[PDB]
PDB file of C-alpha atoms and ligand atoms in Angstrom:
ATOM      1  CA  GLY A   1     -16.852   5.485   1.233  1.00 31.83           C
ATOM      2  CA  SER A   2     -13.424   7.043   1.715  1.00 31.50           C
ATOM      3  CA  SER A   3     -12.775  10.691   2.572  1.00 31.39           C
ATOM      4  CA  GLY A   4      -9.119  10.483   3.554  1.00 30.88           C
ATOM      5  CA  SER A   5      -6.798   9.021   0.930  1.00 27.85           C
ATOM      6  CA  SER A   6      -4.486   7.753   3.672  1.00 26.99           C
ATOM      7  CA  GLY A   7      -4.377   3.975   3.968  1.00 27.23           C
ATOM      8  CA  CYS A   8      -3.274   0.709   2.377  1.00 25.57           C
ATOM      9  CA  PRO A   9      -4.990   0.820  -1.043  1.00 25.97           C
ATOM     10  CA  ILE A  10      -4.483  -2.944  -1.226  1.00 26.61           C
ATOM     11  CA  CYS A  11      -6.456  -4.210   1.770  1.00 29.64           C
ATOM     12  CA  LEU A  12      -8.042  -0.846   2.571  1.00 31.04           C
ATOM     13  CA  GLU A  13      -7.499  -1.091   6.328  1.00 28.39           C
ATOM     14  CA  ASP A  14      -6.182   1.671   8.587  1.00 28.19           C
ATOM     15  CA  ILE A  15      -2.498   0.823   8.999  1.00 28.69           C
ATOM     16  CA  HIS A  16      -1.108   0.583  12.531  1.00 25.04           C
ATOM     17  CA  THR A  17       2.670   0.974  12.747  1.00 26.73           C
ATOM     18  CA  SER A  18       2.535  -0.251  16.346  1.00 25.96           C
ATOM     19  CA  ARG A  19       0.521  -3.308  15.314  1.00 25.78           C
ATOM     20  CA  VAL A  20       2.640  -4.132  12.264  1.00 27.79           C
ATOM     21  CA  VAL A  21       5.498  -2.655  10.235  1.00 25.65           C
ATOM     22  CA  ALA A  22       4.581  -0.126   7.548  1.00 24.61           C
ATOM     23  CA  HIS A  23       6.435   0.201   4.241  1.00 25.44           C
ATOM     24  CA  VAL A  24       6.919   3.887   3.437  1.00 24.17           C
ATOM     25  CA  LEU A  25       6.581   4.132  -0.344  1.00 25.55           C
ATOM     26  CA  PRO A  26       8.952   6.461  -2.243  1.00 28.26           C
ATOM     27  CA  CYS A  27       5.876   8.525  -3.104  1.00 30.08           C
ATOM     28  CA  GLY A  28       4.621   9.188   0.413  1.00 32.42           C
ATOM     29  CA  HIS A  29       2.316   6.320   1.351  1.00 31.05           C
ATOM     30  CA  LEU A  30       2.224   3.459   3.857  1.00 32.10           C
ATOM     31  CA  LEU A  31       1.683  -0.244   3.171  1.00 33.69           C
ATOM     32  CA  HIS A  32       1.782  -3.641   4.881  1.00 31.90           C
ATOM     33  CA  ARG A  33       4.941  -5.755   4.737  1.00 31.06           C
ATOM     34  CA  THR A  34       2.573  -8.457   3.489  1.00 32.18           C
ATOM     35  CA  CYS A  35       0.536  -6.404   1.019  1.00 31.89           C
ATOM     36  CA  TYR A  36       3.701  -4.839  -0.396  1.00 29.93           C
ATOM     37  CA  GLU A  37       4.658  -8.411  -1.291  1.00 31.08           C
ATOM     38  CA  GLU A  38       1.301  -9.123  -2.934  1.00 29.33           C
ATOM     39  CA  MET A  39       1.026  -6.056  -5.169  1.00 31.52           C
ATOM     40  CA  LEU A  40       4.588  -6.695  -6.343  1.00 31.98           C
ATOM     41  CA  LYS A  41       3.578 -10.112  -7.675  1.00 30.60           C
ATOM     42  CA  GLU A  42       0.350  -8.994  -9.351  1.00 34.57           C
ATOM     43  CA  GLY A  43       2.044  -6.198 -11.273  1.00 36.75           C
ATOM     44  CA  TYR A  44       0.557  -2.949  -9.994  1.00 33.92           C
ATOM     45  CA  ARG A  45       2.325  -0.055  -8.272  1.00 33.56           C
ATOM     46  CA  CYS A  46       0.977   2.549  -5.850  1.00 33.74           C
ATOM     47  CA  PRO A  47      -2.561   2.724  -7.299  1.00 31.52           C
ATOM     48  CA  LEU A  48      -2.958   5.972  -5.359  1.00 29.99           C
ATOM     49  CA  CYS A  49      -0.331   8.062  -7.149  1.00 30.45           C
ATOM     50  CA  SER A  50      -2.038   8.418 -10.530  1.00 27.95           C
ATOM     51  CA  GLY A  51       0.408   7.789 -13.357  1.00 27.27           C
ATOM     52  CA  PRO A  52       0.630   7.368 -17.147  1.00 28.29           C
ATOM     53  CA  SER A  53      -1.681   5.305 -19.356  1.00 27.75           C
ATOM     54  CA  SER A  54      -0.573   2.075 -17.678  1.00 24.32           C
ATOM     55  CA  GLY A  55      -1.519   1.435 -14.063  1.00 23.63           C
TER      56      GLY A  55
HETATM   57 ZN1   ZN B   1      -2.462  -3.802   3.525  1.00 24.26          ZN
HETATM   58 ZN1   ZN B   2       1.648   6.817  -3.655  1.00 22.96          ZN
END
């Protein structure tokens, strides 16, 4: 379950700035320097910010 839509939608693990760097998306979300590199390859953008048909 997930009540708060605040967290890396890639790995789904509470991000910890202190622990590791967080990539602030241009939409208003945080990611993991690593994850941000994975999603880019796959071909999917912020799966949280609903968009058009695609995505
Ligand atoms: Zn992540
Ligand atoms: Zn977003």
